[PDB]
C-alpha cells in the first residue's frame, strides 16, 4: 500500500523479509522495539534446544511448530509485528531464516540512523588530541552525515599512523606502509635511471 522507503536496497528471500519487517516497523515506529525482540529471539534459540528443534528438525509437523510459536508468544510486550512475523516464519518452516534476517535488519537500522561502524588500528594508544585530529581525517571517507562509531585497536607493526577498516573499504594511512611504498618506488626508479 503506502509503506516507507527502505534506507538501502538488499538481496533476496532473507533480506527481503528484513526490508518488509523494517518498513512495517517504521510504519508503526517500533524500530528499536522489534530489533530488541529479534536479539532476544537470537538469545532464545541460543538458550534452549527445544526451540531450535522447531527450526532444524524436519520431522516436526507444521501444526506443532505454528501452535508452539503461537502459544508461547501470546503476551509480554512482543509487538504484533514480531508475533505475526514468527507466525509467518513458523508456518513455512523458515524459522532458520531468523539468524540471517536480523543481520539485514541490523544493516537497515544502521543505515536509517546514518551511522557507520569503523575500526582504527593505531600503533600506539591514542590521546585526546591524537583522536580528535583523526576523526576529522576519518570523516572524509563517508559521503554524507554518517557519524562513525570509533573502535580502537593496537598493532606495533605499524610505525605510527592509522589504518581505518570500514568493512567495505580500508584506508592505510600508516607509516609502515609508507616506508614500504617508498622503497618500492625508489627501487623502481634506480632500475630505470
Amino acid at each position: 500500500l503506502k509503506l516507507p522507503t527502505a534506507p538501502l536496497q538488499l538481496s533476496g528471500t532473507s533480506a527481503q523479509i528484513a526490508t518488509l519487517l523494517w518498513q512495517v516497523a517504521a510504519k508503526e515506529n517500533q524500530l528499536d522495539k522489534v530489533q530488541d525482540e529479534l536479539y532476544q529471539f537470537i538469545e532464545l534459540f541460543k538458550q534452549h534446544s527445544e526451540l531450535r528443534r522447531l527450526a532444524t528438525d524436519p520431522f516436526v509437523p507444521t501444526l506443532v511448530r505454528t501452535k508452539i510459536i503461537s502459544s508461547v508468544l501470546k503476551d509480554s510486550g512482543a509487538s504484533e509485528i514480531t508475533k505475526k512475523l514468527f507466525e509467518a516464519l513458523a508456518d513455512e518452516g523458515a524459522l532458520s531464516a531468523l539468524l540471517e534476517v536480523t543481520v539485514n535488519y541490523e544493516e537497515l537500522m544502521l543505515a536509517h540512523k546514518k551511522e557507520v561502524y569503523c575500526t582504527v588500528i593505531t600503533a600506539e594508544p591514542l590521546d585526546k588530541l591524537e583522536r580528535v585530529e583523526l576523526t576529522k581525517k576519518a570523516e572524509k571517507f563517508v559521503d554524507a552525515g554518517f557519524k562513525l562509531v570509533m573502535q580502537e585497536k593496537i598493532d606495533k607493526k605499524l610505525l605510527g599512523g592509522f589504518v581505518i577498516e570500514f568493512s567495505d573499504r580500508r584506508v592505510d594511512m600508516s607509516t609502515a606502509k609508507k616506508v614500504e611504498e617508498f622503497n618500492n618506488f625508489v627501487n623502481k626508479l634506480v632500475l630505470s635511471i
Binding site: 500500500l1 528471500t13 532473507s14 527481503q16 523479509i17 518488509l20 519487517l21 512495517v24 510504519k27 508503526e28 537470537i42 534459540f45 541460543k46 534446544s49 531450535r52 527450526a55 532444524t56 509487538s79 504484533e80 509485528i81 508475533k83 505475526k84 512475523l85 507466525e87 509467518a88 516464519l89 508456518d91 513455512e92 518452516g93 523458515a94 532458520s96 531464516a97 531468523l98 539468524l99 540471517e100
Partner: peptide, 29 residues
C-alpha cells in the same frame, strides 16, 4: 556453539516473501 545449526536458512519455498507479506502487512494497526 549451538547457534551454528541456524547458519544457513533452509527454504522449502521460493515465494516466501508473499506469505510473510500476507502476514506482516496486517500487523500494521
Amino acid at each position: 556453539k549451538a547457534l551454528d545449526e541456524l547458519r544457513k536458512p533452509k527454504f522449502s519455498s521460493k515465494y516466501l516473501i508473499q506469505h510473510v507479506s500476507q502476514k506482516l502487512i496486517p500487523a500494521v494497526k
